[PDB]
Ligand binder design. Structure first.
Ligand SMILES: [Br-]
Ligand SMILES: [Zn+2]
Ligand SMILES: [Zn+2]
Ligand SMILES: [Zn+2]
Ligand SMILES: [Zn+2]
Lengths: 79, 73
DNA sequence: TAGAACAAAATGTTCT
DNA sequence: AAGAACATTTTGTTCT
């Protein structure tokens, strides 16, 4: 267990509840805090991996949610 | 009137094709620079004004296929 | 019409 | 672990 669950690159730790690399960490934070009105140019199942994760922010963010990322994971594991 | 690659607003005829300024500039960069664009779908993404930034592989392919060529005039 | 430059958006890394 | 600040990459506009 040492892979990012969103893009399958090398995980750098748990962030927002999920083992992810640092790039998905800050992507998710930015997506959750701001606008994430993204539009898939395919069929909403683009392949999110180390080279292609730049391609589709819409599917990357759905992959984050699917993997379970959530901003209040910190205060969550406190319960 | 409208870009042949991404359906944005065509600014004129660039490298052989009626394209927009985004696509014009994207095209030169694609062929001159070196990157390896890989499609994350099915090699058939939708390239419109918003989605053109998502898949440079498909955008680039659309460019070539629409006849864009650095050598034209 | 093409380039250059400039500017902005989107992604990723370091935190001596 | 979470997040700021820094840094890069990628895209788009404008002014030659
Ligand atoms: Br920078
Ligand atoms: Zn990742
Ligand atoms: Zn997608
Ligand atoms: Zn275009
Ligand atoms: Zn594509």
């Amino acid at each position: 267990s040492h892979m990012c669950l969103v893009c399958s690159d090398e995980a750098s730790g748990c962030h927002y509840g999920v083992l992810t690399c640092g790039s998905c960490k800050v992507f998710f934070k930015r997506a959750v805090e701001g606008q994430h009105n993204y539009l898939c140019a395919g069929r909403n199942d683009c392949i999110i991996d180390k080279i292609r994760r730049k391609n589709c922010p819409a599917c990357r963010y759905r992959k984050c949610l699917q993997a379970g990322m959530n901003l209040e994971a910190r205060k969550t594991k406190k319960k």
